[PDB]
């Protein structure tokens, strides 16, 4: 299975960079395509971390993918899996498997954050995601 | 007095950036050093706000600071104070002649449990003298403000006006308690870093539980 992700909004959040990086490291650059990027986009609009991993991306929609990437299997009516709750990397991780819900992460200094998604468990996160979650977690506090 | 904070963790959380920024604005960039940063740290890892404020940092421990920052006075044995919650002697105004540096030991995880105070003292048994700052936990910026009041202004701990565990109410159904002792300003309000109350308010609007 190959994966297509529509990324239309401008710029790449750190969250998304970590997610796409994990996906690339798990299925490989030949199995992921970003489609429908803003017309503005050139190759320095793309994060260096993603470029280093060989990210396939285009401004064309998913039907223009075979136009831009001649080494890919044609998109046929009715092989590919498209992203128009799980995180995107979790969703892809499970699909790979086939072919814990609302986990609470507890950190140092009495901090904790629960994440509003289902995850795969020996929870699997993109590399660096735990640090990013920690980064937005507020100092030890009590809700009254 | 100069301040050393062991920052022995990857990353800078937003609340930590606000606290460090407040410390830098208060004591100055020449008087704060972050030490024992993860070995992989480069300037690119330091928040832009802190770089612009002149933050000094090193991956070396506190005994490597003088080598990295040649303008600083030497760390001298017995003249470096370690904040120590297990100590009984509070920092007093008379300690101002005794200490040149005040150290916040790193806070590490529970895997495995570590006693950073004992690690530091075992590494450098001639170096550190323990002091307490009262019997209630403070945020780092509050601890530094408190130390300034005691050492610079010569105000004894028992004469500083504090509030313990202030509660910040954002509406009739939501309030947040910060489980720390804070210094009061002259209007009777706890002194928080710029932006911190906003951050607390932002968290209040987000998903949370009360049990
Ligand atoms: Ni309570
Ligand atoms: Ni609430
Ligand atoms: Ni909260
Ligand atoms: Ni919940």
Residue numbers in the entry:
A (entry chain B): 1 to 78, 100 to 105, 137 to 151, 163 to 184, 186, 190 to 211
B (entry chain A): 1 to 211
Show passages lifted from the paper.
The crystal structure of a C-terminal truncated Sfm1 (Sfm1ΔC: residues 1−204) in apo form was solved by the single-wavelength anomalous dispersion method at 2.0 Å resolution and refined at 1.9 Å resolution, and the crystal structure of the full-length Sfm1 (residues 1−213) in complex with S-adenosyl-homocysteine (SAH) was determined by the molecular replacement method at 2.5 Å resolution. These are two Sfm1 molecules in an asymmetric unit (ASU) in both the apo and SAH-bound Sfm1 structures, which assume almost identical overall structure with a root-mean-square deviation of 1.0 and 0.3 Å, respectively. In the apo Sfm1 structure, all residues of one Sfm1 (molecule A) are well defined; however, a significant portion of the other Sfm1 (molecule B) are undefined owing to poor electron density (residues 79−99, 106−136, 152−162, 185 and 187−189). In both molecules, the C-terminal his-tag (5 residues) and the linker (2 residues) are defined, which are involved in interactions with an adjacent molecule. In the apo Sfm1 structure, the two molecules in the ASU are arranged in a non-symmetric manner (related by a rotation of 145°) and the intermolecular interface involves mainly the C-terminal his-tag, α7 and β9 of the CTD, and the β1-α1 loop of molecule A, and the C-terminal his-tag, the linker, and α7 and β9 of the CTD of molecule B. In addition, the intermolecular interface (between the SPOUT domains) buries about 730 and 1431 Å2 solvent accessible surface in the apo and SAH-bound Sfm1 structures, respectively, which are much smaller than the dimer interfaces (between the SPOUT domains) in the dimeric SPOUT MTases (2 670 Å2 in TrmL, 2 732 Å2 in Nep1 and 2 427 Å2 in TrmD) as calculated using the PISA server. Structural comparison shows that the apo and the SAH-bound Sfm1 assume very similar overall structure (root-mean-square deviation of 1.2 Å for 202 Cα atoms); however, the SAH binding induces some notable conformational changes at the active site. Particularly, on the cofactor binding, the β5-α5 or L2 loop, the following α5 helix, and the β1-α1 loop move towards SAH by about 3.0 Å.
We show that indeed Sfm1 consists of a typical SPOUT domain at the N-terminus flanked by a small C-terminal domain (CTD). Sfm1 exists as a monomer and exhibits a negatively charged surface surrounding the active site unsuitable for RNA binding.
